[PDB]
């Protein structure tokens, strides 16, 4: 299967993904692009509904559990947000600090607002202030 | 008004709230009854001394229930009932005895003689509380089965499971005595009776047939040979399925018309096909006792016509010292031979039947697998069989790891079975017509009107009910004289089997959940209570238990691991595959390759094209040249975009330097993804370091054997909340590669690899378009050696990006890789020979 | 006598010797567990359960692979410890074998203080008397300490240690 030369490695790669595609498609959806389910961004899913809720994390709450829950069901940015535990720098990658922000300890009230509705959604974090 | 008893073995002890009115009554057993019950010693590890405090009241329910007349109304009758209601609400949380015991088992240090006392006791209480089990039990599998969520199909198993098959009768008859014991009163006097109803049956019953004897005195049941003996292990194996259906069918509250109902089909392998026709007659409690005595009619004139047509002789001593010098077995009339093509046997026993006449001619009994058979004969003949295999299997120890593939000396296994006669053979076919007399003269006739679920027969895999001719010919055929073809009579499609033949773990079952491994069927042996760690199949518990447990899926490799098509919302359509997920980008890398992956210049353009690709180290001797390497790709990458570094841990100098470093531009947080170790895996120890001290997203890893490939599992078995990426490659891969064909060794362990969600599987070696490939991302390439779907998560491509512009390879390099013919998978073996499509295998230093 | 933790090759050939009933010379070391019993299939997978509870960690069939070479991989990732199936056959042999009060730690201390011995040594001598099971009430606790001192020497004779 070598025998193009300085055929580049992008036309090489996305040549043979495109045959792959092209094929599952045609096998599995009677080529119809329309059939192929749609997400806002693809990745970051280890290989292992409410428009407005309230959490009461403990000193004993589960961080995947409590995570999950802020982060929610659809793939959107507060997904991401929650979930993701690198975040970039330029071209750097460095430890999530909203996942340290947000980070399950005791007193700690969360609200959202427009839950369904991604783009005016707004998680309000609440703590104890003085009092 | 309750006045509380107390009852102790050493540390543990239970209480139980006795009514004050009937409490002088329960505090006269308090005393008696810790009388009966031994001293207290430490851990309990003495056999008949409780471990748990279920297994107190298990003994105390036990005792109780042995003293009580079931007849006669005693003054432990309400005793009896409020002691088995405490143990029942405590305990037994709405789950069978079954499932608690299993829980204890895996538990407690509660050895298995342990849970069959505890089970036999309590299941002794139960009945003679007069409480029977006639209130429908509410298990998850036969709940989901009237719901349509399993099909439940029914296989027996036959003869050469185990030698001592009468032990799993015996344990019945102790653990059951209260469900079983009627029937094996019934079977034992039929079978007394029909020995004096055929003429000369006391000739073949030298030491008699009291089954019952034998049962209650160990001392009287006969030398283990004569138990063996077709006549006596034909029957006496009916009545051990018969006896597990029963005491299933009993615990779960169903009729044995009601259990046959919920079973989509049945079927057996060879003389368990008589027990899979006598419960498909079978209607009710009443109508039963007939069906048995037909099942077990059949198997009687069979067992004596078969010895009668076939009586085993005396074999010369000189054969068995040196069959045991050898220790392939003592020789039987059924040599098992696994690990070989149907074709090769067929070749060999071909040659053996050449030498030896019509009279003396070994023929192909069994084709229990694809790689599983055994031949039938006479012993001498397939001793002699056995001499012609001993001079062409390779020593056991003997190690084919440096020798190419090809012309490694095939290695296999080929014990006798511990059975009697020569079934599926031409010399018991002179029996046929004395069994088919025999049959009619005692009355014996399956209808296929009054059969009402489908029989699957041995030999083509067809219905028995759609039978023009007697149904009793037929299988008595396929038992005696016609071959069974175990994948042939297993095609249909079932969510689960019950394996309710002898031998349980060693038994059918397990043959028929190697056999269909990874097509969504899950195997249940119904025969024995035990615990597999692997949790692959399932026992008895399984079957009764009522939560989440009972119905547990074995995975489908097509559907869990189906190659997806996504999108996100630009409309880049993605193949979504479990590798795919984790990265985000499509399943298509480009491996460590020294030194066209060396230069930034390349790694950086391929990781700007959108593909993972992998930094070699091996074209860096020290830390300076990393850093240099990475931070120019780093200046060409786009912001938030990562790539992998490759080491080789048969460089021992490279990973020293290059491991901490690595850990260094991690701690300050490089844009390095993952980490490949190729050329040798890692040890657990190193391995572990490399997950947590490093902080990467995954772990590349280049398994290059059998050996590598469990030593990944037991890596990613460690860590199962890592990501492992093994990137199985044959020796066919350009660079550095081994002697291992690319499949093979895929199809032996797969299974075992799917068995971790943690590991994505990639495949690499010969692939440089997307026609070659898709059969193993589909997962159809595996049907062409006859096995179940096998879809792959990725795959990585090593000599087909060479050629590419970026690649800083010479131009005439280039048009020398070009010139390159190549060759197909098959000749990739003759490069240790000759240049083979311009390509030849040297040694390195 | 000083410390020098259990070889797996002792630990393994116990392990099959136990299940096979049979003493602890009477198995050869150069031989697979499949060729021992090539009969029968049912302590095929009892003793590669029994050897998986022990040393956790197993490889791909090892029924086919010999004693020895299996006690080298075995010893790789096995470090003197006594395991799930060893502590479970220990506490059944000193209950039902050696008298009621005579448990493991008075056997111990026994060792301890007439020969010397190390902890380590403690479940070598014991892994020998599992291998030749006195198969008796061994109530008299003076033929009990004999019986432990026969172990001792042929736990010296088998390692090779002086006494
Ligand atoms: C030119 C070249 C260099 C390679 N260098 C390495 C290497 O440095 N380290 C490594 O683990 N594997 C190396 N390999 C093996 C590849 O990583 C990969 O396993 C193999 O190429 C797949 O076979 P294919 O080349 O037929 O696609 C190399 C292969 C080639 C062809």
């Given at each position: 299967f070598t025998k193009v030369i300085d055929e580049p490695i992008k036309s090489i790669m996305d040549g043979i993904h495109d045959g792959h595609i092209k094929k599952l498609l045609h096998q599995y959806y009677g080529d119809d692009e329309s059939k192929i389910p749609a997400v806002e961004y693809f990745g970051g899913e280890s290989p292992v509904s409410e428009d407005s809720a309230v959490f009461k994390a403990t000193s004993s709450t589960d961080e995947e559990s409590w995570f999950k829950a802020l982060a929610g069901s659809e793939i959107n940015w507060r997904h991401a947000s929650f979930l993701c535990s690198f975040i970039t720098q330029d071209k750097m990658f460095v430890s999530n600090p909203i996942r340290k922000v947000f980070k399950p300890s005791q007193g700690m009230v969360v609200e959202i607002s427009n839950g369904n509705t991604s783009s005016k959604t707004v998680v309000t974090l609440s703590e104890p202030v003085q009092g | 008004s309750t006045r509380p008893l107390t009852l102790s073995h050493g540390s543990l002890e239970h209480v139980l709230l006795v009514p004050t009115a009937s409490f002088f009554i329960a505090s006269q057993l308090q005393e008696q009854f810790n009388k009966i019950l031994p001293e207290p010693t430490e851990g309990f590890a003495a056999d008949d001394e409780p471990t748990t405090p279920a297994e107190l009241v298990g003994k105390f329910l036990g005792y109780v229930s042995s003293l009580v007349e079931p007849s006669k109304v005693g003054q432990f009758d309400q005793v009896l009932n409020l002691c088995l209601t405490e143990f029942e609400n405590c305990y037994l949380e709405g789950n069978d005895i079954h499932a608690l015991a299993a829980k204890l088992l895996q538990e407690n240090d509660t050895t298995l003689v342990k849970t069959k006392e505890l089970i036999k006791n309590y299941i002794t209480a139960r009945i003679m509380a007069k409480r029977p089990f006639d209130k429908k039990s509410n298990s998850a599998l036969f709940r989901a089965v009237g719901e349509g969520n399993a099909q439940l199909v029914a296989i027996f198993g036959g003869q050469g499971n185990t030698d001592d098959y009468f032990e799993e009768l015996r344990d019945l008859y102790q653990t059951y005595h209260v469900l079983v014991g009627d029937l094996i009163k019934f079977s034992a006097e039929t079978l007394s009776e029909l020995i004096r109803t055929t003429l000369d049956a006391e000739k073949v019953f030298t030491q008699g047939l009291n089954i019952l004897e034998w049962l209650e005195n160990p001392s009287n049941t006969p030398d283990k040979d004569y138990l063996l003996s077709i006549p006596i292990s034909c029957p006496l194996i009916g009545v051990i399925q018969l006896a597990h259906y029963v005491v299933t069918a009993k615990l779960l509250g169903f009729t044995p018309g009601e259990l046959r109902s919920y079973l989509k089909g049945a079927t057996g392998h060879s003389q368990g096909l008589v027990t899979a026709v006598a419960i498909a007659e079978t209607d009710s409690w009443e109508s039963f006792f007939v069906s048995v005595r037909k099942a077990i009619t059949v198997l009687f004139f069979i067992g004596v016509r078969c010895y009668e047509a076939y009586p085993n002789t005396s074999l010369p001593p000189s054969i068995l010292e040196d069959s045991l010098e050898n220790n392939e077995g003592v020789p039987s009339p059924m040599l098992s031979i696994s690990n070989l093509t149907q074709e090769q046997v067929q070749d060999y026993v071909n040659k053996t039947n050449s030498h030896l006449p019509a009279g003396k001619q070994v023929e192909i009994s069994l084709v229990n697998g694809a790689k599983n058979l055994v031949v039938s004969g006479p012993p001498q003949s397939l001793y002699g069989l056995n001499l012609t295999l001993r001079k062409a299997k390779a020593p056991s120890g003997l190690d084919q790891s440096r020798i190419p593939f090809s012309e490694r000396k095939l290695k296999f296994s080929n014990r006798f079975l511990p059975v009697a006669s020569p079934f599926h053979s031409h010399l018991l076919v002179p029996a046929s017509d004395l069994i088919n007399k025999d049959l009619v003269k005692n009355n014996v006739s399956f209808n296929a009107k009054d059969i009402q679920i489908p029989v699957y027969d041995?030999?083509?895999?067809?219905?028995?009910?759609?039978?023009?001719?007697?149904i009793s010919e037929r299988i008595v055929d396929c038992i005696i004289r016609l071959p069974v073809k175990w994948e042939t009579t297993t095609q249909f499609k079932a969510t689960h089997i019950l394996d309710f033949g002898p031998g349980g773990a060693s038994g059918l079952g397990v043959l028929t959940h190697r056999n269909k491994d990874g097509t969504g069927v899950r195997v249940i042996v119904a025969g024995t209570l035990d615990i597999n760690p692997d949790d692959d199949y399932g026992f008895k518990q399984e079957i009764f238990d009522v939560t989440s447990n009972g119905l547990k899926k074995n995975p489908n490799w097509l559907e869990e691991y189906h190659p997806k098509l996504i999108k996100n919302k630009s409309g880049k359509i993605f193949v979504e595959t479990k590798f795919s997920k984790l990265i985000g980008r499509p399943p298509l890398l480009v491996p460590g390759m020294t030194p066209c992956t060396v230069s930034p210049d390349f790694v950086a353009a391929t990781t700007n094209a959108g593909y993972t690709i992998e930094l070699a180290g091996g074209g860096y001797f020290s830390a300076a040249g990393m850093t240099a390497a990475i931070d120019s790709v780093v200046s060409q990458i786009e912001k938030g975009s990562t790539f992998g570094i490759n080491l080789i841990y048969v460089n021992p100098f490279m990973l020293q330097w290059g491991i901490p470093l690595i850990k260094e531009l991690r701690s300050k947080g490089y844009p390095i993804q993952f980490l490949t170790i190729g050329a040798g895996v890692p040890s657990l120890e190193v391995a572990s370091e490399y997950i947590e001290t490093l902080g990467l997203k995954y772990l590349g890893l280049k398994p290059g054997s059998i050996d590598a490939i469990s030593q990944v599992i037991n890596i990613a078995k460690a860590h199962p909340n890592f990501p492992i990426a093994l990137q199985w490659t044959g020796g066919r891969g350009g660079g550095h590669h081994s002697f291992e064909d690319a499949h093979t060794p895929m199809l032996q362990m797969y299974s075992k690899i799917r068995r971790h969600p943690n590991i994505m599987l990639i495949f690499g070696s010969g692939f440089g378009s997307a026609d070659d490939t898709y059969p193993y991302l589909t997962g159809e390439w595996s049907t062409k050696f006859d096995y179940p779907p096998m879809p792959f998560d990725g795959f990585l491509f090593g000599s087909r990006v060479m050629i590419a512009k970026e690649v800083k390879t010479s131009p005439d390099a280039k048009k020398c890789i070009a010139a390159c013919t190549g060759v197909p998978d098959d000749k990739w073996e003759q490069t240790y020979k000759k240049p083979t499509g311009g390509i030849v295998t040297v040694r390195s230093e | 006598i000083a410390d020098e933790p259990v070889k797996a090759s002792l630990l393994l050939h116990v392990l099959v010797a136990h299940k096979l009933k049979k003493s602890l010379d009477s198995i050869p070391m150069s031989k697979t567990i499949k060729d021992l019993v090539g009969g029968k299939s049912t302590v095929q997978n009892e003793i590669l359960g029994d050897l998986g509870k022990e040393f956790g960690t197993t490889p791909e069939k090892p029924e086919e692979t010999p004693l020895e070479e299996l006690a080298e991989t075995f010893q790789?990732?096995?470090?003197?410890a006594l395991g799930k199936q060893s502590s479970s056959l220990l506490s059944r042999l000193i209950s039902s074998k050696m008298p009621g009060g005579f448990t493991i730690t008075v056997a111990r201390k026994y060792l301890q203080t007439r020969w010397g011995l190390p902890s380590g040594r403690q479940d070598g001598v014991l892994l020998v008397a599992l291998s030749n099971e006195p198969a008796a009430r061994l109530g008299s606790e003076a033929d009990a300490k004999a019986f432990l001192d026969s172990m001792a020497q042929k736990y010296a004779s088998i390692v090779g240690v002086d006494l």
């Open positions: - | 041995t030999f083509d895999g067809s219905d028995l009910r759609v039978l023009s001719g007697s | 790789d990732t096995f470090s003197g």
